[PDB]
C-alpha cells in the first residue's frame, strides 16, 4: 500500500485505509433513485484533532456521503455556568453529522468507526458515535 | 432585555401550550430532536435564541453549516467536505413525543413571518443509541 515520504502516511490518509477496508466487508446499498438524505452518523468526543482526523479521512474513503463542519456540543445534565440560557451554553466537546442516503449504509459506517477507533490510541479511542435518522429527510442544498 | 428573543419564545411557548406530552424521561437520556436549518443563518440564530427561553428543557448546538446534496446531471458530485452557505442547529430532547410536537410548532411558528424565517425547514430526527452530551 502507499507510503508517503518518510515511511509514514497523515492520521487521515491512514483512517480512510481502515475505513476502506472495513466497508469492503458490507456491499450494502449506499444511494437511492429517490437521493434522500434519510440517515446519518453522529460522531462526537474524543478531541478536537482526533475528530479532525476522522472527518477527514471519513470524506477520502465515502464519496457517496456528507459532512458537516466540526461543531461543539452542548451539555446535559446541570449544564456549566454562562451568561446564555443553560440549554445554548456549549462544553468543550465536538462533534461532525454524516449523512447518508440508506439507513442500512448508516449501521455499516456506524460499525466501521467503532470498529477502528478502538485501534487507536486515547483520545481517538474515545470517540463516539450513534446512527441517527430523519423523518422527513434533510434537503441538502 | 432581548425583546425579540423573548417574542420569539413566547410564540414558541403558546404553541407548545397546546399540548401537555412528557418532555423528560427518569432515563434522562438524549434520544430524539430536531434538525433546524434554511431561512438564514440570523434568523435561525434567533429561531435557536428563541427556543432556548421557551424551552428549558432541550439542548442545542451552535449553528453550523450544511454540506451540498447531489448536483443534477452528468458533471463532478461534490466533495463530502464541502460547505454550503446554508446553516442548522440541533435540537436534543430526552423524547420522541415531544420531538414530534416541537417539530409541528416551529413549523406553525415560522409560518406566520415573511421571508427568509418561513423558509425555515424542520425534521424530527432520533439516535439509535441516544447521544451522551457531557
Ligand atoms: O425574526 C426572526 O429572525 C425569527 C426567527 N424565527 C422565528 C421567528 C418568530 C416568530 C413568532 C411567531 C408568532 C408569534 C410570535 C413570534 C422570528
Known amino acids: 500500500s502507499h507510503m508517503g515520504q518518510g515511511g509514514s502516511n497523515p492520521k487521515f490518509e491512514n483512517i480512510a485505509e481502515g475505513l476502506r477496508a472495513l466497508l469492503a466487508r458490507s456491499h450494502v446499498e449506499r444511494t437511492t433513485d429517490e437521493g434522500t438524505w434519510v440517515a446519518g452518523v453522529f460522531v462526537y468526543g474524543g478531541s478536537k484533532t482526533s475528530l479532525y482526523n476522522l472527518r477527514r479521512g471519513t470524506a477520502l474513503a465515502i464519496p457517496q456521503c456528507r459532512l458537516t463542519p466540526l461543531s461543539r456540543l452542548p451539555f446535559g445534565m446541570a449544564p456549566g455556568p454562562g451568561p446564555q440560557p443553560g440549554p445554548l451554553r456549549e462544553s468543550i466537546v465536538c462533534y461532525f453529522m454524516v449523512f447518508l442516503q440508506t ?36 434537503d441538502l442544498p
Do not use: Q, Y
Not at 103 to 113: R, S, T, Y
Not at 114 to 135: E, G
Open 103 to 138: 439507513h442500512i449504509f448508516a449501521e455499516v459506517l456506524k460499525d466501521a468507526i467503532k470498529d477502528l477507533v478502538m485501534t487507536k490510541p486515547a483520545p481517538t479511542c474515545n470517540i463516539r458515535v450513534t446512527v441517527c435518522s430523519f423523518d422527513d429527510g434533510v
